[PDB]
Paper text:
RepB, the replication initiation protein of pMV158, is a member of the HUH endonuclease superfamily, which includes proteins involved in the replication of plasmids, bacteriophages and viruses, as well as proteins with roles in DNA transposition and in conjugative mobilisation of plasmids. The C-terminal or oligomerisation domain (OD) is a helical domain responsible for the hexameric state of the protein, while the N-terminal or origin binding domain (OBD) carries the catalytic active site and is in charge of recognising, cleaving and joining dso DNA.
Therefore, these two protomers must be inactive within this hexamer conformation. Since the OBD of chains B and D are in such immediacy to those of subunits C and E, respectively, the active sites of the latter are forced to move closer to the OD and face it, instead of being exposed at the top of the cup-shaped hexamer.
Numbering used by the authors:
A (entry chain C), D (entry chain E): 3 to 203
B (entry chain D): 5 to 14, 23 to 37, 57 to 79, 86 to 204
C (entry chain B), E (entry chain F), F (entry chain A): 4 to 203
Write the structure that this text describes.
Amino acid sequence: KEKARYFTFLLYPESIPSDWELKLETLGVPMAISPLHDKDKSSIKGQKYKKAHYHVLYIAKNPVTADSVRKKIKLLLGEKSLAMVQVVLNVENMYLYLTHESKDAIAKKKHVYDKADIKLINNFDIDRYVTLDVEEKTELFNVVVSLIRAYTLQNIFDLYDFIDENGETYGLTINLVNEVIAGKTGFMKLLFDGAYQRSKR
Amino acid sequence: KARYFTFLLYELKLETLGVPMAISPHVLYIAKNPVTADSVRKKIKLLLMVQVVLNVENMYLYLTHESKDAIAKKKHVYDKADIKLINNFDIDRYVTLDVEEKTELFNVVVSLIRAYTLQNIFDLYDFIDENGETYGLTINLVNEVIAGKTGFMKLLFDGAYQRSKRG
Amino acid sequence: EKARYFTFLLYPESIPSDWELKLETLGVPMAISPLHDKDKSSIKGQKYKKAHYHVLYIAKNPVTADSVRKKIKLLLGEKSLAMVQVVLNVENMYLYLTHESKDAIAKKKHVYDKADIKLINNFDIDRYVTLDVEEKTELFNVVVSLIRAYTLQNIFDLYDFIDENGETYGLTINLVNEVIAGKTGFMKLLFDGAYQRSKR
Amino acid sequence: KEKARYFTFLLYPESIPSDWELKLETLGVPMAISPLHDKDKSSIKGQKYKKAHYHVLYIAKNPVTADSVRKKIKLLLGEKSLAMVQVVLNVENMYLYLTHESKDAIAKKKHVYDKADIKLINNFDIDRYVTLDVEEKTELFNVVVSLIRAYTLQNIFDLYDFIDENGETYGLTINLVNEVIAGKTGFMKLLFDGAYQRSKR
Amino acid sequence: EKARYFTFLLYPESIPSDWELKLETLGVPMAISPLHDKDKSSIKGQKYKKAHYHVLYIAKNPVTADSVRKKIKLLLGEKSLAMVQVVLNVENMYLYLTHESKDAIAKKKHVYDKADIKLINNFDIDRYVTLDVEEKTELFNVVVSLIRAYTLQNIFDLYDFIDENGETYGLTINLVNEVIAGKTGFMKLLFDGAYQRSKR
Amino acid sequence: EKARYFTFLLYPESIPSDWELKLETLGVPMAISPLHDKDKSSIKGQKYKKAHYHVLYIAKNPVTADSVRKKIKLLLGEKSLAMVQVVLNVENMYLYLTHESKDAIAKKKHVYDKADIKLINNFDIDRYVTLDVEEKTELFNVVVSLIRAYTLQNIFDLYDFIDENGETYGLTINLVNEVIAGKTGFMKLLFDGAYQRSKR
Ligand code: NA
């Protein structure tokens, strides 16, 4: 299933303990807690505001799937604590949505929130998540290698097709691999050469 | 056409355009969109030649005569902070946007080669001749985007070459 | 997987006021960057990135990475850090403390004054660079001799040989990838040689 | 009918009026006049010297045709006053050629002349026309690209032959092609590869 | 901060009697000036500056200046010198040894006898004056025309041509090796051009 | 101040009988001189110096000199040696072991036999001597002529030839690897020429 490093979920005060804030910290995970949403427009005719809720941005180190994260926070708070967990694809925009200031929330006239009420937890630094510095690129590259080995990918088109089909399972996009393999084309040639010989074995 | 321009004169009316600039002890002018240099040079003169800039960094330092052309015949190195900067101009700004559009344009060139199975640089060039504008692309600007990425290019064309023979 | 050089980040908000002195207690050589409080940020609304420190950490023997995780969280406070990465080029990471790497400087980023670097326990940058290059040079020479002995025709055969016998020669897949990066032209020569030699 | 702004042509004292300098200034266009070329050895047999002549560096105000200027000077200076009106591609080499100090002129050990005999008209300043070497290498390259495409040049010998025959039309010599493509051989390989396959179509 | 050519001063007053031999011990080639005992001294007073030597020192591979200073300090004493300076033009520094560089002559400095230069460990200046950019491209262009003229398909054919007719064009095998190093991509294009041209 | 190459004296009078074996205990490579039993002494009337050995000691990493002295004091006795000297040219000291160094020959010191050198812990002099770039450039030019002379079609054929005849031309596998590193494009041109030349 879909595997990513960045996830999000919602919390409602009525159905989680008062101490929820610190129990979130027990996990040792970077998290951004949005300002409480008590002024959101309700789709229910006859109602003014949606139930007050928090948005939570959740960062694992090793890429993990969606159910994993749903499972531990459900265990952490109670089984009546949550429903589903979203996989976040542009965390920079989801961070902005916490204040309804993302390019789509400001676009649909959603209630804006105060960015000072954002509480960051466990050294949440948004900038390290949108940049993917050298150490991350090396791990991503080694992944691409194992993919070319496993599925005997003979050229970059075969690789591209495979990423289109199964990219998210390993946290990969085409524009991502372009960045990762940039300046490594000679290495890329050796792998494709090897794959090529392996497929006439 | 380009976004970075230079010209030379022998203060407030320049701000009237509300367009980023950097005036030396030579004047450097940044358009808001890619625009033709003849156009720009009609506009200043009615206000009060012009050469399109292909690299900003070197001309920023030429406002001091301090880059490789300068070190080649070093003379009369000019002041640093004595520069009039209007309409929020800074150098970090524009070089990092240069980078991002480079990779931008590179990625779309990749998708083109995949989509239409372009086997070599001639087939790519031809496609630019006919359909270039729909993707914001010209021959000279694809040349500048793929310079320094020819090994990447060869990888792509090898792919297309062998996929074409699957059929 | 065991390595010698490591790094991690520290933020002022998450560490006690005596973190520098508590760090030197552990008796390991370390390089600490100047506070990066003027790192220009990509997020369009926070001007500068979170002010932080980079710490260069070198164990004496090749050691586990989570080991390093364990000790610093213990000594500084568990809200202090989360992950320890492992350095492959100390040359650039040492300069990166100051945004004086060629690669980061090529992407600009703010420069800091290297006098604001604090070294702990006689951190000798020249010694770890020189031992890195001659250790990696030998790993390469080892890879060469394996390609000769077993006439390995391409990089897939080499990878397979590593999986089967990597531990015997102190070699992992990810470790050969670092050794042969920037030597692919040499690799091509070796595989070409093996290929023709296997057609004899 | 090719239109450009920079021109050069010959002037013959024999066939121009005494006040010719003052007459040229009236056109109000910047001009550089070479020292009188009276010691150029001539390839015509038996005469040993070329007819004494001046080279004129001509900068029009806006793009204009070559015959346009021919007419302007014929009606100004005389019926046989000038010859070989020519469009200039690099103004700096022509200014150096005025004293036979183009590297291409000294490479043939053409007679060198005194730069102090250069006459400037309407405040011609050479620095106003010099181009940075980086960008000239870029446009010269784009030119070479265009030739390889147009004439389907499959390899560097075919390109060298084309330069031998038609180089001047594009302001190109063998050695300058060598400078331009230095450090771009990977690009060159891509072009010749393209031309090669295209000629098997 | 690494270079190969260095220079520094030595004064007989503050160096051992067998200093010349101790210098040779280091195994690096070096050129030693004639004793500078007659330099007009800008203090006036004593007319001449205290007698001193200039040493031109060539490291085997690039090193720091402090490398060299430390080495001479260990070999000769802490008192023997204060700084080793980095030389950018070996030829001028060699001519300065006798006050015959253009700038020594421009200041009317006392000239010394070139035979009093002491050479150590096969120091030969002609070995370090190399690779003029202007000349390396002209030789290159010559190599190009030879590959065109005689349709030389590969580097063996070129080398054979040099062996037989090199003298005509001022070319030797090793000098071509210098000229084409770092232009091998260009070389390939040329040989491909020749190769296809010989199948016409 | 820390160095890798050291030397010191040992006097039989002041050292244990099993001193040679005790030196092997350290796991450091060492070169021991033939006993200098016939060195002419500047003492009026004594003829010869006290019989002594010179020991060339190769420290594992950069180390301080006093560290090495103390460690020899613990191993052999506190009276075993007095000071440890830093070696600056490892080759020159090794020749000094037999007074076959240029400074020994210049001072006419008694020559000793090279077979009486005792090597310890796989001491090989050729692993410590360093070559200059002019010497590395000629080694490359040498590899070129070998590829020409014996029409070596690939790098395996080249290595095989080095295995068989490397010493004749001052070449080892690993020293070939250093010499051709960063010249793999030139290498491919050479092998192509040899390849096409063998199909002729
Ligand atoms: Na604490």
